[PDB]
Amino acid sequence: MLQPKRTKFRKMHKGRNRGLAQGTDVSFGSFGLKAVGRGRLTARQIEAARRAMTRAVKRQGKIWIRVFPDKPITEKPLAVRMGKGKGNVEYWVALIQPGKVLYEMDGVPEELAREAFKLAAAKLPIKTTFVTKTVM
Amino acid sequence: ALNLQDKQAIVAEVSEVAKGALSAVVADSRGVTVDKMTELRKAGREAGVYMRVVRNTLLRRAVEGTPFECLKDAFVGPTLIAYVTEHPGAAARLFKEFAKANAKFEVKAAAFEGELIPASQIDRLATLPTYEEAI
């Protein structure tokens, strides 16, 4: 599970998730999984989708993970009233905007990359699409 | 399937063989296993006869180049052509005993002389001796 090794602060504001994404094109590999929806990606979802793609291509070629869950999310335990300070950090998320490229793959045929990305997309809470590297 | 460049090349080659040969025998060969074909191929190579199954459309194109344009009508149904390029006949001969013996397929029309040859009367070619008989 991806997680920052250390942070300047432990807890962060909720914030908002407006706007479109940066890094909207395949920059390392040849095929990419681009998010068309908006939402959060927990570190477990990222790891689950990575394993689904890693096993799909039988550990072949190269795989990049363009996102990183750097935002901590706190929760209050059960049977606890409101107040008495912010909750404890439970997991980390990466904010996703439409157009964000999540994963990139290289070294495999396209027809195999589509199935690998299709298996991984089933683990993610946001709608995605298949993209390929283009001549800028 | 077969790109247009393919089929053009298939025609060209069948046509070039048609120029060199001297006796063409055409037959149906549907409903015969590949072993009996493989056997007929060793009998063709042995007897110096060139054997091809080719699309009836595609043969009509080869033929027209000369002098087999009588054979057009022989290209309705499954077609097997027999080009005796070295010596004449022997194919006409070979096909009939092979035809009779195997009671599958038929044999259509042959062609020598730039004249179509009728199914029954092919017995002419199928009895012409050796070259190599005039001595």
């Binding site: 909207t24 681009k34 998010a35 439409p98 | -």
Partner: protein, 94 residues
Amino acid sequence: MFTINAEVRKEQGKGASRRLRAANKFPAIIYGGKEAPLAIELDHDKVMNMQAKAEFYSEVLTIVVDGKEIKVKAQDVQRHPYKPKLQHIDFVRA
């Protein structure tokens, strides 16, 4: 060889450019050389098919505007964030 038909834009801005993309077109610009830059409109899907070929970004294209051919090269392309669409193209005079 790619030839493109274009029309000169009547007005610029965010409001005008979004109306173009709603009308199955998209703006572009032609600069380079000593001439003044020229703002043009392009038919989207027709240009979208041409840019799908790798030589579109390497060879020299001709844009006929007011019946006048201009030889240019594709400089930069602004694509839609998540749709197979174009938003803007920079053309530099060859």
